[PDB]
Amino acid sequence: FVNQHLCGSHLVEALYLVCGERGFYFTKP
Amino acid sequence: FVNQHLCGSHLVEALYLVCGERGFYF
Amino acid sequence: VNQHLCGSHLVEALYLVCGERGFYF
Amino acid sequence: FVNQHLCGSHLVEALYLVCGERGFYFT
Amino acid sequence: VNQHLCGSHLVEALYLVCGERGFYF
Amino acid sequence: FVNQHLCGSHLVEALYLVCGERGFYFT
Amino acid sequence: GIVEQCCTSICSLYQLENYCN
Amino acid sequence: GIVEQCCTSICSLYQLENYCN
Amino acid sequence: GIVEQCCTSICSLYQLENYCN
Amino acid sequence: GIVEQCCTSICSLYQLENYCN
Amino acid sequence: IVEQCCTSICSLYQLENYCN
Amino acid sequence: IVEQCCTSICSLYQLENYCN
Ligand SMILES: [Cl-]
Ligand SMILES: [Cl-]
Ligand SMILES: [Zn+2]
Ligand SMILES: [Zn+2]
């Protein structure tokens, strides 16, 4: 799961630059 | 707001390494 | 110099927001 | 892919370095 | 080079999970 | 300093690069 | 759910937004 | 909420985990 | 130089967007 | 060397931990 | 250099050459 | 290196005198 993971890394770098202020809930299944 | 932002960045890098399946709020 | 390292995040956000676009440094 | 998205983010970073004043540029 | 890059996330998760120590290189 | 943390996240990432085999240590 | 939904393939900035509250 | 919580000063791994459901 | 502008205030998603090529 | 080991399974947090000086 | 250097590693007489 | 190199900048002839 090396790579779900190198990724979920850069995803979250990213929801962040983006939900700006309303933010979000992150279910990893 | 340059440097908050340089930083929210290095943050959510790090939430993720760490919550892994339960999800998160806030 | 900050400018030699912002130079480096800028070089990277520029690199996610700029998506594919790139940038001159 | 999420994988090379990730590698470029890396070289941008190397040239900034060798060249100096002299600079360098990245596409 | 995954290895020279995971070598650099790893020199960085190693530089984040490893902090000051440095690492053998 | 989130700022030199953030600069060394960056030099490590740099000598990894200059010395090559010979390595270099980053200490 | 979002991972099921963004790791293998890149999510841009909008999608990423439903999952916003 | 979390920003306020981690930007000028370095956040280590466990803080980060509360915000977890 | 940009070095001199975004490294000087933040740019919204909307302002970075400004040095991109 | 390291590059050899974590770069193959994830290392839970547990396994990265092995290369630090 | 993404590809010269994302597939094998590059020297500095070599990255010298990528300035100015 | 942080002197010759984080507040000004080092060149690599100079970063080379830092290798093994
Ligand atoms: Cl990577
Ligand atoms: Cl930085
Ligand atoms: Zn990476
Ligand atoms: Zn940085």
Short mmCIF file of C-alpha atoms and ligand atoms in Angstrom, two decimals:
data_model
loop_
_atom_site.label_atom_id
_atom_site.label_comp_id
_atom_site.label_asym_id
_atom_site.label_seq_id
_atom_site.Cartn_x
_atom_site.Cartn_y
_atom_site.Cartn_z
CA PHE A 1 0.00 0.00 0.00
CA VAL A 2 3.77 2.41 -0.72
CA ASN A 3 2.41 4.11 -3.21
CA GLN A 4 -1.67 4.85 -1.45
CA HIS A 5 0.36 6.15 0.74
CA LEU A 6 3.27 8.58 -1.53
CA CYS A 7 -0.14 9.70 -2.89
CA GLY A 8 -2.60 10.28 -0.01
CA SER A 9 0.82 12.59 0.57
CA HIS A 10 0.80 14.80 -2.15
CA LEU A 11 -3.85 14.62 -1.59
CA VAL A 12 -4.14 15.93 1.28
CA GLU A 13 -0.96 18.84 -0.08
CA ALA A 14 -3.42 19.50 -2.33
CA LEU A 15 -7.51 19.64 -0.17
CA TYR A 16 -5.58 21.82 1.60
CA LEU A 17 -4.34 24.37 -0.92
CA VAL A 18 -8.10 23.95 -2.08
CA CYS A 19 -11.33 23.72 0.71
CA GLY A 20 -9.78 26.89 1.74
CA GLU A 21 -12.00 27.77 4.61
CA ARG A 22 -15.52 25.16 4.68
CA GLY A 23 -12.66 22.40 4.98
CA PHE A 24 -13.54 18.67 4.61
CA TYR A 25 -14.02 15.17 6.14
CA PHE A 26 -11.26 12.45 4.89
CA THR A 27 -12.67 8.75 5.20
CA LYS A 28 -9.24 6.58 4.06
CA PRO A 29 -11.33 3.19 3.66
CA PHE B 1 -0.63 34.90 4.76
CA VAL B 2 2.88 33.43 2.74
CA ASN B 3 4.62 31.79 5.13
CA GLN B 4 0.67 29.97 6.64
CA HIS B 5 0.03 28.95 3.85
CA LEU B 6 4.15 27.38 3.23
CA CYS B 7 3.40 25.80 6.25
CA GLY B 8 -0.73 24.24 6.04
CA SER B 9 1.25 22.65 3.36
CA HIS B 10 4.05 20.84 5.03
CA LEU B 11 0.53 19.99 7.62
CA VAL B 12 -2.04 18.15 5.97
CA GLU B 13 1.62 16.20 4.66
CA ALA B 14 2.21 15.25 7.65
CA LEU B 15 -2.27 14.17 8.77
CA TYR B 16 -2.30 12.02 6.35
CA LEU B 17 1.22 10.10 7.15
CA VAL B 18 -0.30 9.78 10.34
CA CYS B 19 -4.84 8.98 10.47
CA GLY B 20 -4.52 6.70 8.05
CA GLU B 21 -8.57 4.83 8.21
CA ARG B 22 -10.79 6.68 10.61
CA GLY B 23 -10.79 9.98 8.89
CA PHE B 24 -10.51 13.31 10.22
CA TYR B 25 -12.50 16.55 11.09
CA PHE B 26 -11.52 20.36 11.39
CA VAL C 1 19.06 33.42 0.35
CA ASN C 2 14.39 33.12 1.42
CA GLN C 3 14.53 34.23 -1.64
CA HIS C 4 17.05 31.35 -2.70
CA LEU C 5 14.19 28.68 -0.67
CA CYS C 6 10.57 30.42 -1.36
CA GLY C 7 12.34 30.38 -4.53
CA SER C 8 12.48 26.63 -4.10
CA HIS C 9 7.90 26.29 -2.79
CA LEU C 10 7.22 28.75 -5.09
CA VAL C 11 9.17 26.77 -7.51
CA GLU C 12 6.79 23.60 -6.07
CA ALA C 13 2.86 25.47 -5.69
CA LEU C 14 3.87 26.98 -8.72
CA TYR C 15 4.77 23.57 -9.75
CA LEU C 16 0.49 22.18 -8.23
CA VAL C 17 -1.62 25.29 -8.91
CA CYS C 18 0.46 25.96 -12.04
CA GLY C 19 -0.25 22.26 -12.72
CA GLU C 20 1.47 21.44 -15.75
CA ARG C 21 2.22 25.20 -16.69
CA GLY C 22 5.78 25.59 -15.23
CA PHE C 23 7.59 28.83 -14.45
CA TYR C 24 11.38 31.30 -15.12
CA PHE C 25 13.07 31.64 -12.51
CA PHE D 1 0.29 9.35 -12.41
CA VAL D 2 0.24 10.18 -9.41
CA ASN D 3 4.36 8.78 -9.39
CA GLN D 4 6.50 11.38 -11.82
CA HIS D 5 3.99 14.08 -10.44
CA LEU D 6 5.46 13.44 -7.74
CA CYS D 7 9.81 13.28 -9.45
CA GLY D 8 9.65 16.78 -11.04
CA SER D 9 8.45 18.16 -8.13
CA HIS D 10 12.36 16.94 -7.35
CA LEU D 11 14.87 18.24 -10.30
CA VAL D 12 13.33 21.75 -10.00
CA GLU D 13 14.56 21.74 -7.13
CA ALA D 14 18.76 20.55 -8.46
CA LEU D 15 19.50 23.23 -10.98
CA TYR D 16 18.33 25.86 -8.95
CA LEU D 17 21.64 24.85 -7.49
CA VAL D 18 24.81 24.28 -10.13
CA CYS D 19 24.19 27.35 -11.96
CA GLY D 20 24.06 30.07 -9.89
CA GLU D 21 23.93 33.78 -10.95
CA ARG D 22 24.66 32.65 -13.95
CA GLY D 23 20.48 30.68 -13.29
CA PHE D 24 18.81 28.18 -15.05
CA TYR D 25 15.10 27.56 -16.29
CA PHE D 26 12.08 24.44 -15.97
CA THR D 27 9.44 23.08 -17.93
CA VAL E 1 16.16 7.21 -9.56
CA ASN E 2 12.44 5.78 -7.31
CA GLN E 3 15.21 4.88 -5.33
CA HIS E 4 17.42 8.31 -6.04
CA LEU E 5 13.38 10.04 -5.30
CA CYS E 6 11.76 7.78 -2.65
CA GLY E 7 15.79 8.47 -1.77
CA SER E 8 15.03 12.18 -1.76
CA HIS E 9 10.84 11.53 0.25
CA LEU E 10 12.75 9.05 2.00
CA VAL E 11 15.91 11.69 2.53
CA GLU E 12 12.66 14.13 3.32
CA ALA E 13 10.07 11.36 5.42
CA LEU E 14 13.76 10.48 6.64
CA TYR E 15 14.64 14.16 6.91
CA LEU E 16 10.43 14.29 8.66
CA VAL E 17 10.17 10.87 10.36
CA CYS E 18 14.29 11.17 11.04
CA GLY E 19 14.46 14.78 11.90
CA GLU E 20 18.26 16.28 12.82
CA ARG E 21 20.23 12.95 12.71
CA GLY E 22 20.77 12.91 9.56
CA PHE E 23 20.97 9.84 8.01
CA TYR E 24 23.83 7.57 6.31
CA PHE E 25 24.47 8.43 3.13
CA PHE F 1 12.37 27.46 12.17
CA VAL F 2 9.83 26.22 10.25
CA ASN F 3 12.09 28.45 7.66
CA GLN F 4 15.97 26.68 7.87
CA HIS F 5 13.51 23.29 8.33
CA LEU F 6 12.02 24.02 5.66
CA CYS F 7 16.22 25.22 4.01
CA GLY F 8 17.79 21.93 5.00
CA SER F 9 14.68 19.98 3.89
CA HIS F 10 16.19 21.81 0.97
CA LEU F 11 20.59 21.41 1.16
CA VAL F 12 19.91 17.64 1.70
CA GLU F 13 17.96 17.43 -0.80
CA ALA F 14 21.52 19.72 -2.62
CA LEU F 15 24.83 17.72 -1.62
CA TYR F 16 22.73 14.54 -2.24
CA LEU F 17 23.27 15.98 -5.24
CA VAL F 18 27.47 17.64 -5.57
CA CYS F 19 29.46 14.92 -4.15
CA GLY F 20 28.05 11.98 -5.64
CA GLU F 21 29.56 8.54 -4.90
CA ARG F 22 32.11 9.98 -3.02
CA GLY F 23 28.49 10.87 -0.82
CA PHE F 24 28.76 13.31 1.38
CA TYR F 25 27.50 13.25 4.54
CA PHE F 26 24.38 15.65 5.78
CA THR F 27 24.82 16.03 8.73
CA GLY G 1 -16.04 7.67 -0.11
CA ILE G 2 -12.62 10.32 -1.38
CA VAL G 3 -9.36 7.70 -1.59
CA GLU G 4 -11.55 5.33 -3.12
CA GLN G 5 -12.43 8.28 -4.96
CA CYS G 6 -8.32 10.24 -5.58
CA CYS G 7 -4.87 7.88 -5.44
CA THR G 8 -4.39 6.51 -8.24
CA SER G 9 -5.71 9.27 -10.18
CA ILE G 10 -4.80 12.88 -9.69
CA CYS G 11 -8.18 14.88 -8.04
CA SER G 12 -7.93 18.60 -9.07
CA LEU G 13 -8.83 21.24 -7.05
CA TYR G 14 -13.20 21.24 -7.41
CA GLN G 15 -13.68 17.53 -6.45
CA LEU G 16 -11.63 17.85 -4.04
CA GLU G 17 -14.28 20.58 -2.93
CA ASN G 18 -17.90 18.02 -2.19
CA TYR G 19 -16.09 16.53 0.18
CA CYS G 20 -15.90 19.88 1.60
CA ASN G 21 -18.82 20.36 4.38
CA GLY H 1 -9.68 24.19 14.32
CA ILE H 2 -5.88 22.52 12.94
CA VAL H 3 -3.76 25.73 11.24
CA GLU H 4 -4.17 27.61 13.80
CA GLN H 5 -2.72 24.69 15.42
CA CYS H 6 0.79 23.66 13.19
CA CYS H 7 2.46 26.71 11.10
CA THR H 8 5.22 28.61 12.63
CA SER H 9 6.08 25.95 14.69
CA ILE H 10 7.09 22.55 13.55
CA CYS H 11 3.71 19.71 14.47
CA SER H 12 5.06 16.17 15.11
CA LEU H 13 3.26 13.01 14.19
CA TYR H 14 0.67 12.23 17.06
CA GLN H 15 -0.99 15.71 16.95
CA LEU H 16 -1.69 15.37 14.01
CA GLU H 17 -4.08 11.95 14.84
CA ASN H 18 -7.36 13.70 16.79
CA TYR H 19 -8.68 15.04 14.14
CA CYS H 20 -9.18 11.51 13.16
CA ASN H 21 -13.63 10.08 13.53
CA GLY I 1 11.71 39.20 -9.92
CA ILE I 2 8.54 36.55 -8.38
CA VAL I 3 11.05 35.90 -6.16
CA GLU I 4 10.74 39.45 -5.28
CA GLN I 5 6.29 39.41 -5.46
CA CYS I 6 4.79 35.95 -3.89
CA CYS I 7 7.59 35.68 -1.87
CA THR I 8 6.89 39.06 -0.65
CA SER I 9 2.26 38.23 -0.03
CA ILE I 10 -0.14 35.10 -0.51
CA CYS I 11 -1.37 34.49 -3.27
CA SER I 12 -5.53 32.79 -3.28
CA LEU I 13 -5.67 30.10 -5.28
CA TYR I 14 -6.72 32.77 -7.36
CA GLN I 15 -3.06 35.20 -7.28
CA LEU I 16 -0.27 32.29 -7.84
CA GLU I 17 -2.12 31.60 -10.35
CA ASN I 18 -0.38 35.19 -11.55
CA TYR I 19 3.77 33.67 -12.21
CA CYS I 20 2.78 30.72 -13.77
CA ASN I 21 3.92 30.76 -16.96
CA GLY J 1 22.02 0.27 1.47
CA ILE J 2 18.30 2.15 2.51
CA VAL J 3 17.38 3.14 -0.33
CA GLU J 4 17.04 -0.59 -0.76
CA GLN J 5 14.46 -1.43 2.16
CA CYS J 6 11.41 1.31 2.34
CA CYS J 7 11.31 1.97 -0.70
CA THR J 8 9.81 -1.60 -1.14
CA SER J 9 6.53 -2.11 1.53
CA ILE J 10 5.34 0.79 3.40
CA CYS J 11 6.97 1.14 6.00
CA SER J 12 4.14 1.74 8.79
CA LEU J 13 5.56 4.35 10.46
CA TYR J 14 7.30 1.65 12.14
CA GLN J 15 9.76 0.53 9.48
CA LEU J 16 11.25 4.19 8.40
CA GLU J 17 12.30 4.52 11.23
CA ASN J 18 15.43 1.86 10.54
CA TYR J 19 18.16 4.66 8.50
CA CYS J 20 18.23 7.31 10.55
CA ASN J 21 22.02 7.98 11.68
CA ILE K 1 17.20 17.10 -17.18
CA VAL K 2 13.21 15.20 -15.79
CA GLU K 3 14.01 12.40 -17.77
CA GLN K 4 18.46 12.56 -17.58
CA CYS K 5 18.43 12.92 -14.46
CA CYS K 6 14.44 10.86 -13.21
CA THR K 7 15.75 7.91 -14.84
CA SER K 8 19.81 7.93 -13.81
CA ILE K 9 21.56 9.83 -11.74
CA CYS K 10 23.71 13.23 -13.20
CA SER K 11 27.50 14.64 -12.37
CA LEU K 12 28.25 18.18 -11.76
CA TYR K 13 30.98 18.74 -14.70
CA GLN K 14 27.64 17.39 -16.01
CA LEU K 15 24.59 19.52 -14.22
CA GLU K 16 27.68 22.58 -15.09
CA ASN K 17 27.23 22.22 -18.10
CA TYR K 18 22.89 23.43 -17.34
CA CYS K 19 23.86 26.81 -16.24
CA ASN K 20 23.32 29.96 -16.95
CA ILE L 1 27.97 25.06 4.10
CA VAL L 2 24.53 27.10 5.68
CA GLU L 3 27.26 30.31 5.37
CA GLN L 4 29.08 29.90 2.27
CA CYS L 5 25.55 28.49 1.27
CA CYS L 6 21.70 29.58 3.18
CA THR L 7 22.64 33.32 3.39
CA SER L 8 24.51 33.59 0.23
CA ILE L 9 24.84 31.41 -2.14
CA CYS L 10 27.66 28.63 -2.80
CA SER L 11 28.85 27.59 -5.76
CA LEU L 12 29.35 23.89 -6.35
CA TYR L 13 33.95 24.53 -6.63
CA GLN L 14 33.37 25.81 -3.74
CA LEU L 15 30.15 22.94 -2.43
CA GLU L 16 33.16 20.48 -3.78
CA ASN L 17 35.76 21.22 -1.69
CA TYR L 18 32.50 19.39 0.64
CA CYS L 19 32.43 16.13 -0.81
CA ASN L 20 34.40 13.02 0.08
CL CL M 1 7.56 10.77 -4.82
CL CL M 2 9.93 26.50 2.76
ZN ZN M 3 7.73 12.60 -3.93
ZN ZN M 4 9.67 24.80 1.86
#
